[PDB]
């Protein structure tokens, strides 16, 4: 079989960045070569054919150049609605076969997060487990400490984080904080805190609330 | 315009068969092939092969002959994909494509299903609120959700007033909780000004255990 093989597996850049994206065949391909952008869970979208036809509705940054088994995609200008995972696809030879994709992202300007606290909620204590969210929205870059306390005292092992994807439009990011207790353990303490740190806050944030208010 | 809708997909125990459906519409479904194509995270995206519907003649990558079959119904215009003695690590998104036209590359995909490779039992979510309060409101914004809880397997899909409300909407990518069992949250930021004149909804599909909730989603008072 013709094996794809896509260099780097991932990169990050700026918008304003040039961009580029290399695929070696193990044989000749003779520009019988595709690429695809992807968008985390959506489906591949046809970006280049014949090794350098832009599709339907591509922007004109997109290029694609080479031949024989080494082809290259190019970003003239990054901007952020190009996070993506790229692939190449040869369309030469059965099987049809893929590289193993090259995940993009964003580097940009910082922006703070926003921070927001849920309580669990009366119907979740009804069945006899609490779980509390602490919300991060909208922040740059990925890299954020939060940390729960209850009662003022450090809490570990009953978390868990959840982090979006980068948007598209302004390449933020977003973030879940969950600590999951039993109701028990719950209603022995009264103070439940979320505190974030994070480069765009100038100290690090508390969010809190009484247990039973 | 063209359109592949897939149908089929979830949970099967590992040696077992589960068949997927693709169903076309927007051109004349003899003049083109479907093409089956499987993505998990590995091994990436790989083909699996084609059938012509004219003919019914189909064609495979070789690695997938022993558990992959292709088929037609044209009556239908669908194309299906049969899965025999399955392994755990056929797990993966299953997608139908058909060519941009004849031998070009992959123009029109199906939306992918999961297939999941497992014998664990299925399970529906619990959904609750995440209310809107102070302690979730500043600025003339307010950030209100859904908690998605204890569900296997993956996927849930999670709308907000029927598809409606799309903007500034986050739904998570899920946990694996220690009891083997998911959870994520969506949430949406709206204007504090509106929660009383404006209502909120999130749609819950957990199509695995036939689970279908919709959640109002109300302030509290605090």
């Known amino acids: 079989d013709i094996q794809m093989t896509q260099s780097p597996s991932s990169l990050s850049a700026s918008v304003g960045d040039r961009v580029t994206i290399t695929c070696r065949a193990s044989?000749?391909?003779?520009?019988?070569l595709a690429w695809y952008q992807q968008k985390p869970g959506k489906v591949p979208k046809l970006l280049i054919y014949?090794?350098?036809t832009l599709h339907t509705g591509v922007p004109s940054r997109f290029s694609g150049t080479g031949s024989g088994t080494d082809y290259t995609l190019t970003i003239s200008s990054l901007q952020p609605e190009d996070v993506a995972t790229y692939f190449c696809?040869?369309?030469?030879?059965?099987?049809?076969?893929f590289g193993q994709g090259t995940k993009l992202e964003i580097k940009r300007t910082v922006a703070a997060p926003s921070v927001f606290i849920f309580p669990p909620s009366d119907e979740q204590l009804k069945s006899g487990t609490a779980s509390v969210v602490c919300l991060l929205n909208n922040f740059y870059p990925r890299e954020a400490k939060v940390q729960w306390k209850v009662d003022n005292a450090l809490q570990s092992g009953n978390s868990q984080e959840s982090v979006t994807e980068q948007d598209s439009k302004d390449s933020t990011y977003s973030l879940s904080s969950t600590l999951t207790l039993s109701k028990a353990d719950y209603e022995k303490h009264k103070v439940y805190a979320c505190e974030v740190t994070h480069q765009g806050l100038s100290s690090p944030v508390t969010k809190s609330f009484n247990r039973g208010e | 315009e063209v359109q592949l809708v897939e149908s089929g997909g979830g949970l099967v125990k590992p040696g077992g068969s589960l068949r997927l459906s693709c169903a076309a519409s927007?051109?004349?479904?003899?003049?083109?092939?479907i093409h089956w194509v499987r993505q998990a995270p590995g091994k990436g995206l790989e083909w699996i092969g084609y059938?012509?519907?004219?003919?019914?003649?189909?064609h495979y990558n070789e690695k997938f002959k022993t558990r992959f079959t292709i088929s037609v119904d044209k009556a239908k215009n669908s194309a299906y994909l049969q899965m025999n003695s399955l392994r755990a690590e056929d797990t993966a998104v299953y997608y139908c494509?058909?060519?941009?036209?004849?031998?070009?590359?992959?123009?029109?995909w199906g939306q992918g299903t999961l297939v999941t490779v497992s014998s664990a039992s299925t399970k529906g979510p619990s959904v609750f609120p995440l209310a809107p309060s102070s302690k979730s409101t500043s600025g003339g914004t307010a950030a209100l959700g859904c908690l998605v809880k204890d569900y296997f397997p993956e996927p849930v899909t999670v709308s907000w007033n029927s598809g409606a409300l799309t903007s500034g909407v986050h739904t998570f990518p899920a946990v694996l909780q220690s009891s083997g069992l998911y959870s994520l949250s969506s949430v949406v930021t709206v204007p504090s000004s509106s929660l009383g004149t404006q209502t909120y909804i999130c749609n819950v599909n957990h199509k695995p255990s036939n689970t279908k909730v919709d959640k109002k989603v109300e302030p509290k008072s605090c």
């Open positions: 494509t058909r060519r941009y036209y004849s031998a070009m590359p992959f123009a029109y």
């Open positions: 927007g051109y004349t479904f003899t003049d083109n092939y």
């Open positions: 059938i012509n519907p004219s003919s019914a003649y189909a």
């Open positions: 044989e000749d391909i003779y520009s019988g």
């Open positions: 014949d090794s350098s």
């Open positions: 696809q040869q369309n030469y030879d059965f099987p049809l076969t």
